[model samples]
Target: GMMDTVKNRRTIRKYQQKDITPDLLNDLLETSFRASTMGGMQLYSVVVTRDAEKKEILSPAHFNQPMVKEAPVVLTFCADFRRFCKYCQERNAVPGYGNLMSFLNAAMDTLLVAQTFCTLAEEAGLGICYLGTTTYNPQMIIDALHLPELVFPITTVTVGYPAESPKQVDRLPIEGIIHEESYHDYTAEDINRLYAYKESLPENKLFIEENQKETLPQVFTDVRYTKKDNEFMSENLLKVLRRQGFMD
Candidate 1:
């Protein structure tokens, strides 16, 4: 019942100060560990923060998201290659950590674990909001969690009881977003068709206009930041990747 869960699941931001029960927390962790892993390596680790002071430290790291501060339980999902590598070394085996393959494997492992945890939280009548900002400050997370090298923070998940009921957000048409075997090319007509499909929903249409502060087409064109068009390419994005030796 994906539909059953999908219909009920919403990004719950606000929560009461009431702490999450210890029993419920254990269920969430157990369900998350049940997620499939790469060669049973389980290239992911969960850092659960119940400390109020630690929450204060992480709250700003998540774009100052109030939900992080409000939520009773905050967990950071990490792509961990360090633990596996250490285990291999203890067995007098050479562990590969520099390869891009290991990185991809770790990322996939972390994502799968996150999916399982989210499902479990939802089933237990709790709401979750995923903060993507953790990727923006991986070092901060590493320091906060005392994570070893080769264990990168992939994402943050905040879970707690609901504070408000936000309306469901509309999704784009399947044809417009999905592709068959080969990639689907978009033409002017296709763009218009997509817009027409999206515009059918009053809420989505209004959201686009208000959030973008521009019309559908205008919003797309105006905010599309190319490497050549933006200084962040040389200043931030490239700098970060180059520092990590991910780009040459």
Candidate 2:
């Protein structure tokens, strides 16, 4: 059943006007909490938004992705040390979770729950779309949500009934992704062998032509994810981490 779900999962952007029941949403959230966490500590939190105005406020943080506003539910999974730290302080224990390692562990915990939620939601016939803009514009999200220190948004997922069915996208070969006992770095021949199919695809060829680029990688580097944008977003994210007391 899980294999069937995994094979059919799609990143649905178009959604129907139907609303999800609160009970079903709660069940999905509860199921997501079953994901593994660091040190048996659930170092994550979720902010669920169903209010139209609040969704509007959060839209820009997701680069104004239509799903952010159109979906019936937008769930923001956060790497949260604030809650645990408070508990520690109340117990008269010193908490040292303000460092990068703690932030990484919390981020891992957050992602685990998010992935689990997506799988369960898809299995329940709900569509899901993950927004990567959460990291790029976290300060805006923090200000909108009034998040406290040690709370950083890691990812956001939009869920609703699907309005359209999109074809499954391509993935690299399993052999390309898997390494044996020791890592085997790819050679030029290996790279070509692994990516030849992808680069030869009609859509990818069109992508190169539409972007006026020499190659597919150039389209990604020059248009979609440029060095300039990457540097700017990285600096902004670092600023947010420090402001949220996770970089100290």
Candidate 3:
């Protein structure tokens, strides 16, 4: 059941030395392509890195996330309009997809494929971890992967057999974000109630103290996702979007 799969699975960072045999990987990826896309355009591409040297080239751009190298496979999912545009060109059809909306549409399609792949891969006895660092440096990814224009790497995932069983991270309760009839803004009191359980966690406490922050929220706002870091990363990403012709 999907419920069992969702509830039981945790992101595994450490991996066994075992490789993902080709037959199973090919089969899973083929099935994962069944995830719905925007209209009839499946505007996404996944680049798989298996070679150690290729992993070495990609790891630095991923901010040296250990999973990029340790995992047997690193999958980079991209919002790719290159093939569609080329098809349109060959047919003498015009494409108006070199804009933000098109990028977003393709990006969503890419995520659908990426997530579907992850779910199916996990069910097939593989452990997976998502690397959020993909967005921070698309230029490096582009050069390393030989990505052409109109193709932007959106996110990355590392997959392999688990070497260690990690505890699942806390997720928000259904009641916290769900709105029944209308949109209801969270009040101060509401937020306190919603976040109470998470703030009480020992791991969160350690994060705060270790970072010398007063609270868990501060740990994120100040250390994990600071304004300086966010702005810096976003600037580079926005430039990459323009250079990739997605912001035209």
Candidate 4:
């Protein structure tokens, strides 16, 4: 049944206009809290936005994704050290979490909770879509959510009932990702074999033609995700890390 759930799961972009009940949302949150965390410290927090005005303000942070306005709820998951630091100070303990390692640990914890929440939501017949733009424009999200200095918005999820049943996407063979013992580097032949199926797809071919590109990878590099954009976003993210007190 778990495998069945995984196999049937797909990223849902279009959502029905129905609102999610508070009780159901609470249940899903409770289930997500059961996810494992480092040193039993749940260094994460979620901000749920249901107000139309708030969602409108938050949409630009996610590049004006339609789901931000259309979904019944938008959950912003954050790597939070604010609460922990306050607790430490209240107890007269020194907190040394304003650093990259600590931020990475908190980020891992946040991602665990996010994935667990998505799985539970899907099982409960709720559709969910993760917005990767959270990291790209965290400063805008922070301003929109009024996040504190020790809290960094890491990811966002839009949730509601599904309005469409999209086809499942492709993945590489398990052998491509799995390692038997030590890490094995990918050979050129391995790359060719692994990407053949995806490259051969009609949709991908159409994408290449539409973009006037010779290959699918070029479509990604030249259009979807360019080196220039990546560098700009990286710099912006670093600035956010420092501003959030995660690089101190």
| Model 2 lDDT, full chain set | 0.93
Give the higher-TM-score candidate: 1 or 3. 3
lDDT of each: 0.77, 0.93, 0.91, 0.94
Give the clashing pairs for model 2.
none
All-Cα superposition RMSD per candidate: 3.3, 1.0, 1.0, 0.9
lDDT of 4 by residue, 24-133 (tens): 99899988978999988899999999999999999999999899999999999999989999999999999999999999999999999999999999998889999999
lDDT of 1 by residue, 13-45 (tens): 878668898888987888788899989889888
Kindly give the number of clashing pairs for every candidate. 0, 0, 0, 0
lDDT (tens digit, per residue) of candidate 2 on 1-248? 87899987879998899999999999999999899999889999999999999999999888888999999999999999999999999999999999889999999999999999999999999999999999999998899888899999999999999998988878999999999998999999999999999999999999999999999999989999999999999888888999999985
Off by over 4 Å in 1: 197-212, 216-248
Off by over 4 Å in 3: none
Residue 159's lDDT within candidate 3 is: 97
Best by lDDT: 4
User: Which 10-residue window of candidate 3 scores lowest in summed lDDT?
Assistant: 166-175
